[PDB]
Amino acid sequence: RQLINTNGSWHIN
């Protein structure tokens, strides 16, 4: 998929 699970991180920026 285009999506990739962050494995527990609510956000990344």
Partner: antibody, heavy 128, light 113 residues
Amino acid sequence: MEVQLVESGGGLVQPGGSLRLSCVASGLTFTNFAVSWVRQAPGKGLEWVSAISSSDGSTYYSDSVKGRFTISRDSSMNTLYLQMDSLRVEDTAVYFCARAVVSSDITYTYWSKYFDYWGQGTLVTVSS
Amino acid sequence: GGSQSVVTQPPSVSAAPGQKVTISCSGGSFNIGNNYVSWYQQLPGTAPKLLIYDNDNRPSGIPDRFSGSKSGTSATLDITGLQTGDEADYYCGTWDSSLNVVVFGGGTKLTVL
């Protein structure tokens, strides 16, 4: 084994006062998931409030609770909390603990954040 | 009293047992337009439960008469073979890249009659 996300600490309080909610997971893991608190005011819809990352412990808040609420976890690894200070009547609501599945594309622009399990919730009433 | 929502849903939907029902969510570019939608069932006095995730996926214990789709800044939840046990409040949910919160639709009360 029963599967449970139990919240507690809800109660009646005067505006300006404070309360601490806790959410305890049983029969489910927090490993590889984030966790959020979502509330529902009297007769209204669901409103996201705050979240914590199980990975690095990063914390996040809606603008309406910033500076007043504090989300945290302890070494049990299956428990989180929501300290609520300087409460306001509009903070009145049932507070749900909900496990979040988080994903994004490689450029961190497109996001998928959904809640795959929720607790029955705890009621918080702020009024004089 | 009355108000406006970031993501809008009809206040109520109704149909007789066996019929089809559709609930839509209308948002903007920063929420439904660019992010993934999920749907929830909140039974009276009950913990909300996930029905659909990432626009059209169904979690393991959810019957296929529940389905979701996304188009533009809009999303839809389809429920066929309506049953009395389906009475509940339904919410779509999505990240909003502008407000930086997971926004939930206003909610739709499903009555089966």
